[PDB]
Every structure is written in C-alpha cells, then in structure tokens.
Amino acid sequence: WRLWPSGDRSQQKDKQSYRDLKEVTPEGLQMVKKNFEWVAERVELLLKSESQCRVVVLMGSTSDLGHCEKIKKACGNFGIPCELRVTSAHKGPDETLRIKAEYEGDGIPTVFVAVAGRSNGLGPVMSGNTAYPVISCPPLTPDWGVQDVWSSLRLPSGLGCSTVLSPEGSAQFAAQIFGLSNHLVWSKLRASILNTWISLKQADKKIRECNL
Amino acid sequence: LNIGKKLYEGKTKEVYELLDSPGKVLLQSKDQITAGNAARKNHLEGKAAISNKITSCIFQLLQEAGIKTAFTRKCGETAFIAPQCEMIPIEWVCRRIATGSFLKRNPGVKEGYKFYPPKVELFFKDDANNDPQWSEEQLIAAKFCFAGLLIGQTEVDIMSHATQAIFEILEKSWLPQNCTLVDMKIEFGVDVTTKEIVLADVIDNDSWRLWPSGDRSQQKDKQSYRDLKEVTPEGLQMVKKNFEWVAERVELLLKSESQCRVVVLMGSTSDLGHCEKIKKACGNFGIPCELRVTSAHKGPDETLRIKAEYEGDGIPTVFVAVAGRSNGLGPVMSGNTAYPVISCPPLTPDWGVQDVWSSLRLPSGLGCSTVLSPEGSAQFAAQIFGLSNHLVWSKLRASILNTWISLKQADKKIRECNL
Amino acid sequence: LNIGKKLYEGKTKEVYELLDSPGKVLLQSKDQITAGNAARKNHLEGKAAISNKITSCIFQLLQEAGIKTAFTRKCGETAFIAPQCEMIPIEWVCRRIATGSFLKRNPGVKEGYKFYPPKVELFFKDDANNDPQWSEEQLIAAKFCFAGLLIGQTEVDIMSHATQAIFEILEKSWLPQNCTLVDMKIEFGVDVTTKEIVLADVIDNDSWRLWPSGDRSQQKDKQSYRDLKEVTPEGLQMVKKNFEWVAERVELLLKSESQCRVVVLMGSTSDLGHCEKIKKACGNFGIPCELRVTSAHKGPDETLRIKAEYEGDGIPTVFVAVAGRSNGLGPVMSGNTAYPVISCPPLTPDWGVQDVWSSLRLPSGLGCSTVLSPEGSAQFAAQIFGLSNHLVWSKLRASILNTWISLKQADKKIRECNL
Ligand SMILES: Nc1c(C(=O)N[C@@H](CC(=O)O)C(=O)O)ncn1[C@@H]1O[C@H](COP(=O)(O)O)[C@@H](O)[C@H]1O
Ligand SMILES: Nc1c(C(=O)O)ncn1[C@@H]1O[C@H](COP(=O)(O)O)[C@@H](O)[C@H]1O
Ligand SMILES: Nc1c(C(=O)O)ncn1[C@@H]1O[C@H](COP(=O)(O)O)[C@@H](O)[C@H]1O
Ligand SMILES: Nc1c(C(=O)O)ncn1[C@@H]1O[C@H](COP(=O)(O)O)[C@@H](O)[C@H]1O
Ligand SMILES: Nc1c(C(=O)O)ncn1[C@@H]1O[C@H](COP(=O)(O)O)[C@@H](O)[C@H]1O
C-alpha cells in the first residue's frame, strides 16, 4: 500500500520510501526500516474500538420478547452489545423515564429500539424525552399491522422517532448509526454489502443453468 | 401399414379403415380436379400430392395452434392418417371480402366489401340441389345425430365460432407471404372415439380464395380453373402452376417469422415457484423463457449488466420483474430499457393490498405495466409477440375459441340439473 | 446560397461560413479517400456524394429519433448545412464486437468477443502521435473549454452515454438489412448558439464497420481500403463498390418495416381529456392513435363490432381501455382479442384506491395489463411496437438518454446552491 500520515506524500511510511532512493546506502536502509517500524507500532490499533456502542430494546410486554431476541441476536452480528428491558409508556410512564435516564447517564452512546404492539406510545414518549436516537420496531402481524403502524409514523412536531419494521433491519439501522463513529461496525456493514452481492451473483450463476 | 376396406369414396379422395389402428383412418387423395358437382372433371398429375401436402401443412398449423382437428400425421406424398369421424353434411363458409356467390345472393353489394367480423354461412351438402344455403334454424330443426351427438343450438354455435377462428388463423398465417385469404369452406365431423366436434375433411387449394397482394387477377386457388371458358390442355397446365405456387409456399406458414423471448428477473430465489409458473405458461405459447436472479436494491450494477446482455444480442425480449414487498426491480428496469417491462409481483393477501402500489404509481418517463396473474404475465407477453409472430397470435386466438367452447360445455352440463 | 470564408479544411471535407445564415455552416465533402498518417490517400470519384448521402440519411435518422445533432438539411449531392459548432477534439468509439485496435491493445482477446453493454473508448485527435487513447480522467484534466462550455465530469459522462445510445440506434437500424454494426467512431461539438453538446462532424462509411450477415470477409466499410497490401486501381474499384453498396441501402433505415396503431376505447365522452393525453403521447412516438366511444355495459354488441373492425384490416394494434368506476371495458376487450389490451383508468384521489382493483384482479385467461399514467400507457404501447419497429425503438432509446441528460443538468444546477 501507500500510507501518507496527514495525507502528506513527503511523510510516506510505506515501501515507496525504498523504491524512491536514487542510491541504496546503509543510511537509506535505516530510514526505510524506521518507516516499516512506524507502521508496525500502529497497525495493532486498527483492531481497537475508538467508541462504545449500545442498543437498548424497550418492550411494553414480555409477549413481544421473541421479536426483541431477534433484534438482540442481529446486534451481536455487528459486535454491538444489546440490552432488553420491560417498560410500558401507558401503565408505567414514570418507570419508562427512570430507565431511559439510567442509559442516558452513564456516558455510553445509545440507540433505543421501542417495541410496542397496537398503539405504540413507547417510541413517541421515548423520542420526546431523549436526545439519543429512537427507532420504533413494532411487532406488526397481518391481522392489524396496516392499522397499528400509523401510531409509529404520524407523530406530533418535535419528534425525530424513525420506523423500521424488520427486527434484523432495526439492528442494521442501529449499526449504520454507530458505523459513523466506529470503524469496526462500519467494516462489518461494508463487508456485508459485498457478501450479499456475492450471494446474488452465486444464486444467479446457479439458476442460469436451468436456462440451458 | 395394414389397409382394410374403403369407407367413403369421393371425386378427389377415398377413406379406408386401418385394421392395425382402431378408430384411425387413411385419407387417400386422387389425381382429379372437379367443378359443378362432377359436371366438369380432369386428370391432373401431381394434384393428389399437392392436395395432401396443403391439407397436411394446414392441419398441422391449426392443430399446433390448439384447434381441434381430425389429423394424426402425413402418410407419404398422397395420404394422411386421421381419427375416424362421422361427417356433418354442412359446408361452413367464412368471408373477409364479398365475392362469388355472396354477390349473386346479394345483388347491389360490390366486389371488395369487407366483413368485420368475418361472415359465416352454412350450405347443406346435396349435389342434386347445388348445395342450398341453410339458416342456423334449419340446421337445428334437422335434429342430425352423428356418433350419438345430437347437433343442437350448442353444437351449431360451436361450429359457427370455430369456422370464424379457423379463417382468422389461416388469414393471419398467409399475410407474411403477401397473400389475402378472401374466403374458405370447411367441414366438421364428430370423432367416433372422443365424441368431440373437430375440423375434418381437407383444407386444400379448392377450399379457399387466395389473392397475392390482394389482387383478384393473380388468383392462385381453384377459381382459376372454375372460371375457364373452355378447359384446354394449355389451360390445365396454368391451373397446375397455380396449385404448385400454393404448394411451394404453404410449408412457410409453419415458419416463425420473428424470434421471441421472455426474461423473468426475480429479486430472490424464494420467488422461484412464482417464476416457474410464468415460464411454464410461456411454454404453452411456444415462447422461450429464461429465469435470472438480480436485486435492484442489493445489486443494481448487476441488474443493468443482465439487462444489457438481453438488450444486446438482437433477440426481441419482454422483461417480467418479480419483486415482493417494495418492487424497485420493475421501475429500475422500466427506466433503463426501450423493451417492455411487466411487473408481476408475487402478491399474497397478508400485505398484497399495500405492496401492489409500488408497481402501479411510477414517476413520469416509465411505461412499466402491472399484471397480477403469473399465467396472465405470460399471456400478456404472448399478446405483445403476437403482433409480430403469427404462430403466437394463432395460439392466443385458438385459446379464445377453446375457452369459449369450455363455457358452452359447462353451461350445457349444469343446465341438465335444472330439469 | 452565399458562401463565405473557408473556416476549417480536413482530408475529406471543408466547412464554409454562410453570410445569408448566422450560426449555420456548409460541410462540403471531397472526392478523396485516406487511411493512416503516412501516404495512403487517393482520388475516388463519387465519394463526396456517397459520404454526403450517408451522413444526411444517418443524421436525419438520429435527429428524428431525438438525438441532438448538428444537422439542418442536405444541400445538393455533396454538401449539407449544419449549426456552427466548436468541435471537441475526441474520437468516441463504441464497440459491440472486439476487432481492430481493441485486439492490439488487449492481446489474448479473440475476434468476436461481445460487449454487453457496448464498450465506449476515447482517442485524443492528434495525427502527429496517431490518436492516442485517453481515459476519462485525462479528458477531465485537460480542462477543455469550447464555445464557453468547460468540459468536466458532467459533459464527459454525457458524451459517453450519448455515444452508446447513438451506436445502439444505428445498430438496431441496420439489423433489418441483415447488417451487423460492429463498431463506430463519432465526434461531438458545442453548438456556438445553444451551448449544447451535439453529435457533429459526419457519420459515413469511414465512421463504422458493417458486416453483411455478421461476416467480416463481406465488410462494406472503409476497412476494405485500410486492409489492401497495395492500392491498385482494381483495389480502388472494389472499395468504391463497397461504398456504393452502403449508399444504395442507407435510405432504407428511414423506412418503417411495420405498421403500428393504438386504439383508445372510452366508455364515456367525459373521459375524452384523459384520452387526448394518450393520443398526443402516441404522436411523440410516431404511432397513429384513434379514439372511439363504446361501453361494455350499455353496448357490448358494439364493443365487439368495433374491436372486430381493428382486428380485421391487418394493422398491428394495441387497445387502451379507458373506463372509470368498475372498468368492464378492459376485461371484455382483453377476453375477446389476441391483441394486447392496456387498461388506463382515469383514476382520481376521490375513489381511485377502490376503482383500480376492477382493472387488476381479473378471471383466469385474461392477459389485460394496467398502466395508470396516460403518457405511460402510450409509452408502454410504444415499447410493444418497438420490438418490431426500429423507428419507435429509436425514439424510446433516445428518450432514455435525453431524460438522463436532463437529470445530469438539473443536478448540475442544484449543486451550485451547495457552495
Ligand atoms: N473512423 C475511424 C478511424 C479513423 O479516424 N481513421 C483514419 C486514420 C486517421 O485519420 O488517423 C483511417 O485509417 O481511416 N479509425 C478507426 N475508425 C473507426 O472507429 C472504430 C474503431 O476502430 P479501431 O479503433 O478498432 O481501428 C471503427 O469503426 C473504425 O472504422
Ligand atoms: N398526539 C399528540 C400528543 C401526544 O400524544 O402526546 N401531543 C400532541 N399530539 C397531537 O399531534 C398534533 C400535532 O401537534 P403539535 O405538533 O403542535 O404538538 C395535534 O393535533 C396534537 O394534539
Ligand atoms: N370449396 C368450395 C366449394 C365446393 O365444394 O364446391 N364451394 C365453395 N367453395 C369455397 O368456398 C368459398 C365460397 O365460395 P362461393 O363464393 O362460391 O360461395 C370459396 O373459397 C370457394 O373456394
Ligand atoms: N422488492 C425486491 C427487490 C428490489 O426491489 O430490488 N429485491 C428483492 N425484492 C423482494 O423482496 C422479497 C424479500 O426477498 P429477500 O429478502 O430474499 O431479498 C422477495 O419477494 C424479493 O423479490
Ligand atoms: N368476474 C368474473 C367474470 C366476468 O366478469 O365475466 N367471469 C368470471 N369471473 C369471476 O372470476 C373468478 C375466477 O374464475 P375463472 O378464473 O375460473 O373464470 C370467479 O369467481 C368468477 O366468477
């Protein structure tokens, strides 16, 4: 590769320092060795997380737990710790705000996922009372889903609350948010674009055989 | 081949039983041409082979379109094998252009009057009385029974509709040879095994009027012979060349004049079964159909590369986009090709009311259509190719007839449970 | 015709000012053939007229498709009038089939490799260094300015896309002559008045490779001259025959190979405005379009009679059914014709969500499609006719290009508010 500290070519740390010597002297080889050592002293830091990430899934009822386990598992695929909590905006709004505050208060950057079926008040109340992002991921079913979703979507002014229906999608959206400030999350999202694209190529190659 | 006794004997053909093949017969053409209930006749060498060649090409054409027809296979230069039928003694005439007897029975109508839709008439077979015209009322009142089928309103209606469809198919088929099919006569029979009414007898150069470039003076059919003041041995050689002209070209009606292809693009292998139904249905119309897997959302670069492979090889193509949920595949394809794109989304009642709108409400500059039925997708694609391909057109036209016959048959069945 | 000063002088043509016409010039072809940057050069009588005829037919073809082109009209046997442009000194090559310099610069690739989509390359015009290939990066870095237009990323992207579209249209247009367009070179200019990049210079038998029946040994283009070991006057006569062969056929690219017609059927005269939009939109694709009034529900006998008039006259037809509320018109038409039927219901936000399902959920055996946009329904009908008509196809292809260019131009404008 070519590696420029501060994007400055004259600070090149790669083998180009050796390619560019008019004449190889043992003084020239010592500079090239220092450049290699400089890269070697820093490369292990690419494996280090520069930012903490956390998703908190808030569920209005334990009957939605299975939907919440899918989000949590999906967060694991992106290396993002994910906590489940039970709170109802309608039956325990005092407790919703207390739980919110525990996660707001410990310094760890957090995305909230609100999982509430029927009339989702949980995402709205959370969205209105935190500066952190909130994603509604309602556990919609074809029975009443067409009716229930509008409670997540049409909110009063001053509410940033987003909606992602896929539970794996809600984790992926939360990963995309953390990927702006965490290169390890970003890299899993980028590789995942590649791998999915490769899977399509491989599936099209297979099905293309039935056309001969 | 094991020949048995002669069953029917006419002035141009003979029918024999086949002891080897139960319920099949051999129709042997003869080297004879006739005009006016055998009051004019002539030996003509090669006429048997010309007649048999034309009816064999035409019956294969009609049969492969889906018309129910008394034809098994050709059997040498001068015969063909058919299912045994009891002939219905009616001449069914269909006209696009008024000429001949239509002018004599309708003084004041001028040669060239066009019939939309094609005009159907019935004539009772009777040499003695010069084949008098019958009304449908007369034929129903005859209470004819053949192979046990009573010929009533339903059967008369079926022969009338089938006569029009057969004419249309032959008319469309001759067009690419620059020949106007003016009119024709056909006969139906009842298959002694299936009891179904089927096109029978023969269709040859005595069966129709065929004008190259729609010009009457370039007549290629038997009218060339009927019209002759005097039958000279020089006149009979001209009539012979006309029959040979038809005989050369008739085999070209079986030639596809244009290549056709459907490409079904699916965003996921989970939609494969829906895509198989489209492909099967394309097979019913004789249209090659390829399946490919590409996602406009996860691999749009590849959607365009696949599009380009099918745009680029010269084969006329219809794309069918099969994408569930938010269909982006039809839109992206529609926006990037001059070829037609059909969205056929695999809708289910769970979310289909919501999903359909992604196919329907498109930005300007998009001609993308929507067909919900997978079999319908293929049918729509056939209809587009039928504008440029007479074989596809003909399967669609015969299918209109056969569907309509099925309704008549189902109504006749259920009408019994009302007694 | 008041000629002025000689503005530019090339190896095979001269450009003159027109004192009578501000912003127009005359391109005069010469009786000269050349190849390479040594002494392969020859007088060839009739070449000026052949060159001028071909570029005049081709530019008319591309201009009438909607490709923006420096062409006003033919002006005698050997010249044509054009809007004045500042030429961009790039040779834009497009290839369907790898031959020629593509094989030299890519050793290992074999004669006949197919490009999907067609491959675009750039060569800088400079005879001194034999026209070296440039990257898009090199062209952008050159910061060329012509008639005040800086040639940046947007302009390079537009000439690249247009090169491919122009190739595709010429390729499709030669197909009905059984000729394979293998590759071509074109040049663009900036129109000094409009400031638009337009196809310019000429397109003639020096501009492309044309293989009858896709056979290289039958090459009809200037390659026949490039390939001579030695120029003899017997060699020059063969090359002249090849040029004449192209010139004798090029006018046929302007000929329609198929008739096209849309029939818009409306259940009520209150939908007429919606129907006028479809008809106008059909005009943009050069497709005649007829309006008729018929109701499936109040006059189904008449619906079928009208259908039959259009089925019966031999002209390939697409039906558009325009019926508000419960659309029975598309369904009844779809069920009774082998031709395609498109429902384009005049939906409004009052009841449109309810009314559309009458077009969409049809009994089995119905191919009927739905297109909500009235301009869309014409575009869909054009896409169907484009499978069998190169002139319609070419307008659809150019329209993809022009719409894409409009987006590029609108993004370039809005990008300024971000500085
Ligand atoms: N118009 C020209 C030119 C061209 O300008 N040639 C002159 C030479 C010169 O003027 O420098 C000549 O030799 O004819 N060279 C190729 N092409 C066309 O471009 C596509 C690419 O051809 P390749 O790059 O493979 O030679 C094919 O269609 C050629 O006919
Ligand atoms: N549904 C709610 C809630 C809530 O549920 O707390 N607060 C305001 N609203 C309603 O949203 C609309 C927009 O109001 P604002 O955007 O001005 O808050 C109003 O009709 C309001 O009653
Ligand atoms: N093949 C026969 C016979 C016959 O069997 O004598 N009579 C008429 N036709 C054909 O029927 C159409 C109508 O003929 P008319 O106009 O004489 O009724 C024509 O195509 C004719 O060849
Ligand atoms: N709507 C689209 C698109 C697209 O528009 O690009 N790609 C796939 N799909 C559809 O989404 C469903 C989920 O499929 P996957 O989750 O396996 O991609 C399928 O029915 C597919 O056709
Ligand atoms: N709506 C209509 C019409 C019509 O309107 O003519 N014909 C059949 N159908 C209905 O479509 C469904 C599919 O029926 P088929 O696909 O077997 O025709 C049935 O419930 C039928 O009554």
Swiss-Prot record, chain A:
Positions of region (Linker): 48-53
Phosphothreonine, modified sites: 25
Gene: PAICS
Residues recorded with modification Phosphoserine: 61
Outcome reported for the amino acid change (mutating residue 187 to A): No effect on phosphoribosylaminoimidazole carboxylase activity
Binding site for CO2: 119
Organism: Homo sapiens
Annotated disulfide bonds: none
Pathology linked to this chain's protein: Phosphoribosylaminoimidazole carboxylase deficiency: An autosomal recessive inborn error of purine metabolism, clinically characterized by multiple congenital anomalies and early neonatal death.
Subunit details: Homooctamer.
Membrane-crossing segments per the record: none
Protein family (similarity comment): In the N-terminal section; belongs to the SAICAR synthetase family.
Name of the protein this chain belongs to: Bifunctional phosphoribosylaminoimidazole carboxylase/phosphoribosylaminoimidazole succinocarboxamide synthetase
Protein purpose: Bifunctional phosphoribosylaminoimidazole carboxylase and phosphoribosylaminoimidazole succinocarboxamide synthetase catalyzing two reactions of the de novo purine biosynthetic pathway.
Modified residues (N6-acetyllysine): 34
Annotated region described as AIR carboxylase domain, given as residue ranges: 54-212
Domain of life of the organism encoding this protein: Eukaryota
UniProtKB/Swiss-Prot annotation, chains B, C:
Binding-site residues for CO2, renumbered to this chain: 326
Region (SAICAR synthetase domain): 1-254
Positions carrying Phosphothreonine: 232
Any Pfam family matching the protein: AIRC
Single GO BP term: GMP biosynthetic process
Modified-residue entries (N6-acetyllysine), positions: 30, 241
Pathway(s) per entry: Purine metabolism; IMP biosynthesis via de novo pathway; 5-amino-1-(5-phospho-D-ribosyl)imidazole-4-carboxamide from 5-amino-1-(5-phospho-D-ribosyl)imidazole-4-carboxylate: step 1/2; Purine metabolism; IMP biosynthesis via de novo pathway; 5-amino-1-(5-phospho-D-ribosyl)imidazole-4-carboxylate from 5-amino-1-(5-phospho-D-ribosyl)imidazole (carboxylase route): step 1/1
Name of the protein described by the UniProt record: Bifunctional phosphoribosylaminoimidazole carboxylase/phosphoribosylaminoimidazole succinocarboxamide synthetase
Lineage, opening ranks: Eukaryota, Metazoa, Chordata, Craniata, Vertebrata
